[PDB]
């Protein structure tokens, strides 16, 4: 009875050096949640890039919460060519019954300048 977040745009194409920004919108039910940003390595191995609430202790991956309590920007700062890949966001339903329910994944294309 809890909906997963959605991850848009489907295909984000940017020129190298520019910042590429994703939007994961999560309509939380109760504020005991956490959103995570993932990048799929070879053989479907998920690496956590950043998260909200921001740990604040790579800094090129930042998560910003919009004035509405739904939309979030995951922005790569100064995107490189090797940042092209498959990305997705996931919500973990901690306290109680911790469950990672994932969004649909999105593709990032970084083109030559």
């Amino acid at each position, epitope marked *: 009875p809890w909906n997963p977040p959605t991850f848009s745009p489907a295909l984000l194409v940017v020129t190298e050096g520019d910042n590429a920004t994703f939007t994961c919108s999560f309509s939380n039910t109760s504020e005991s949640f956490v959103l995570n940003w993932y990048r799929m390595s070879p053989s479907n191995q998920t690496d956590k890039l950043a998260a909200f609430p921001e740990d604040r202790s790579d800094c090129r991956f930042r998560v910003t919460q919009l004035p509405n309590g739904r939309d979030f920007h995951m922005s790569v700062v100064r995107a490189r060519r090797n940042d092209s890949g498959t990305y997705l966001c996931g919500a973990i339903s901690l306290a*109680p019954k*911790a469950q990672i329910k994932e969004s649909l994944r999105a593709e990032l294309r970084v083109t030559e300048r």
Partner: antibody
Amino acid sequence: EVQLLESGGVLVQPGGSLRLSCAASGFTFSNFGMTWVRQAPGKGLEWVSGISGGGRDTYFADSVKGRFTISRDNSKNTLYLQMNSLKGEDTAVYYCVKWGNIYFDYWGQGTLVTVSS
Amino acid sequence: DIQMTQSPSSLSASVGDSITITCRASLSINTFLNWYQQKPGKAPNLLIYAASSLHGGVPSRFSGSGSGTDFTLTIRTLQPEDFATYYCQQSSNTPFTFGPGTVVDFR
């Protein structure tokens, strides 16, 4: 860096009441939930209570529910644990813990609460 | 309630040995295990989250594995600043329950 400073641990007689305070500094306190974890003298770690971070959601263990109250005041970056109907069993070292994820990042050095006559 | 158990209860080893300690849960949690190190008179420190992820600043020799009910902590090259008590803690279901703890001693 991140520091959690517990205060208020004093010798209290059984049946009394005491409120513990945690001074949070080094991170956005309002964005993270918090928990209290106690270690009884000679015993293991036991989870006491948890707060959502915005204060709307509260979680309690069976051993303290109805007797302990979890609260937070993000204005001054302080976490409170109101301990009522104290028992001798409740004598433990109470740790202020940074919640907000699967895992418990940082632990304060704790405050000692002794319940005896 | 999910009851957590650990084995061994106590451990004696010298510097350089490889140590593997286990943690078992009464029912499946599948990743939601944490490993903590407590030194005497001090607050516990986080080592492993999600049962295999290394917390920032923890030496790479510390490693965790396992899913479901059985998990393991591994210390590849034991060093003097590692002799302490280790607890495992499940985060799948409230209330959060800890393991009895495993004491690592100097021999």
